[PDB]
A paper describes a structure:
ERα contains structurally conserved globular domains of the nuclear receptor superfamily, including a DNA‐binding domain (DBD) that is connected by a flexible hinge region to the ligand‐binding domain (LBD), as well as unstructured AB and F domains at its amino and carboxyl termini, respectively. The LBD contains a ligand‐dependent coactivator‐binding site called activation function‐2 (AF‐2). AF‐2 binds the signature LxxLL motif peptides of coactivators such as NCOA1/2/3 (also known as SRC‐1/2/3). In the canonical model of the ERα signaling pathway, E2‐bound ERα forms a homodimer that binds DNA at estrogen‐response elements (EREs), recruits NCOA1/2/3 (Metivier et al, 2003; Johnson & O'Malley, 2012), and activates the GREB1 gene, which is required for proliferation of ERα‐positive breast cancer cells (Ghosh et al, 2000; Rae et al, 2005; Deschenes et al, 2007; Liu et al, 2012; Srinivasan et al, 2013).
The 2,5‐DTP analogs showed perturbation of h11, as well as h3, which forms part of the AF‐2 surface. These compounds bind the LBD in an unusual fashion because they have a phenol‐to‐phenol length of ~12 Å, which is longer than steroids and other prototypical ERα agonists that are ~10 Å in length. One phenol pushed further toward h3, while the other phenol pushed toward the C‐terminus of h11 to a greater extent than A‐CD‐ring estrogens (Nwachukwu et al, 2014), which are close structural analogs of E2 that lack a B‐ring. To quantify this difference, we compared the distance between α‐carbons at h3 Thr347 and h11 Leu525 in the set of structures containing 2,5‐DTP analogs (n = 3) or A‐CD‐ring analogs (n = 5). We observed a difference of 0.4 Å that was significant (two‐tailed Student's t‐test, P = 0.002) due to the very tight clustering of the 2,5‐DTP‐induced LBD conformation.
Residue numbers in the entry:
A (entry chain D), B (entry chain C): 687 to 696
C (entry chain A): 305 to 461, 465 to 548
D (entry chain B): 305 to 549
The structure:
Amino acid sequence: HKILHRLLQD
Amino acid sequence: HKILHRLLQD
Amino acid sequence: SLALSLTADQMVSALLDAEPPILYSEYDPTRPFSEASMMGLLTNLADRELVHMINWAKRVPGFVDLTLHDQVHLLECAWLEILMIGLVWRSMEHPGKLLFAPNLLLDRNQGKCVEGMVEIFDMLLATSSRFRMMNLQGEEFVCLKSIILLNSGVYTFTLKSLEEKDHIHRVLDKITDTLIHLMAKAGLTLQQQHQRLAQLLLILSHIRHMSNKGMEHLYSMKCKNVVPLSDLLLEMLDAHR
Amino acid sequence: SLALSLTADQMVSALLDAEPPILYSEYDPTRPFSEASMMGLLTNLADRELVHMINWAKRVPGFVDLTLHDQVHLLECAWLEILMIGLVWRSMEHPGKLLFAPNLLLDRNQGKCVEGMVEIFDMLLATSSRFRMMNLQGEEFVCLKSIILLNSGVYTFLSSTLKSLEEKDHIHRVLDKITDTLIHLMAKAGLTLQQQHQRLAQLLLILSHIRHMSNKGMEHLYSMKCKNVVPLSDLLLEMLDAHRL
Ligand SMILES: Cc1cc(O)ccc1[C@H]1CC[C@@]2(C)[C@H](CC[C@@H]2O)C1
Ligand SMILES: Cc1cc(O)ccc1[C@H]1CC[C@@]2(C)[C@H](CC[C@@H]2O)C1
């Protein structure tokens, strides 16, 4: 998964 | 030439 | 001046009367579509529509008040946007299809014929679907198209000059008055009025987007010698680079 | 739900509270600019602003109601527009200058330091001048920025499927609320009914030029990347790769 994906959860 | 310029006059 | 004197009803009828005709394509169905031939049809059509657009622009209240230099800039900036909004208007009653001409009705799969064009067809179709969902009216459409003409290039124009910008904004305000007046007549509540106004104007942002992408696509087709563009078309395209 | 119940005043304060911080540049003012050094500063800044933008987006009423996928789409489509409108707002009271950061205030000529960037500076400056002459208010700014986030990418949502249509309609409901908010602010400022509608139209039409600047900026940033003038962060690269051009 992309970085943007991760930041939107964290 | 500038066809647009001319077309605007005609 | 005089455009600023126009009533809402006068503004509407003037724009309605200025509407350009619907043109036919030189589509010949005796030969199969190729990337080159489809680009040929579409650009041939666009070229002929441009001539009518230029004369249409002259009939948009306040446009001929501007310098010839500013008229050129506006059309150079908004031409593809104007072609696009007209297209999506023609296609409203044809779900899943784009009515480039009465004899040229294309679906997204036919857009696949040209490299990178289906993405543009998809965006245009979604815009057409949005208009259909909003139940866009003819009077509203002509107002939106004239707004695109006057607005798109105004931010890229100091001297006076500063007066050219002010005049443009005055006319834009008059069209805003016209749109609201139209919605009020239609029976929309005061709240619904400014909500719809916003919805319609926000779509212009997506139309600008489609134009930017379309300009890059048309440019790449040119740079690969896929299609020979008319001198007028080459100059309009050249204005964005 | 939830965001649709908010009052006009509640929408404003919610947006004001969500506002991201004004980041500083690492710029060392003792050293002159090179093409590479300026691109480095600007992209380093943008990269750090993106992290804050993502967390700000989550604080925009109704945004977290959307699927993870849709949130991604909206940000990918709108990130550069959001950076730009922020820039023009910060630079509003600095005519002829672009305040990327309190310690990085660049004038138009310094845009020439980088190939093809001055034309983009010109567009940003003209936008800031338009804001300045309209006397754009802070409460109006926050409304406009949230509108960009929700609006820019909504038209490219894949329809079909029940969930998708429900997403688009939620976005438009929230967008209507923000419109109500903008109008509320103008009515509160004492503008007549006609003036409110005109100002609204004026503000929204600017977003069309902002979209234009983003498209142009994306092409420039992409050209810079390919010419290897500047090393871009992984995040910045993926956001750039979402526009696939
Ligand atoms: C939108 C549109 C409306 C028209 O009335 C005519 C033509 C067009 C497009 C059709 C697709 C293109 C050939 C170019 C722009 C991007 C593509 O290269 C022009
Ligand atoms: C607008 C903006 C606002 C910011 O808060 C940070 C950065 C930027 C720009 C600055 C210029 C660029 C480096 C790219 C886009 C086009 C150029 O490549 C990002």
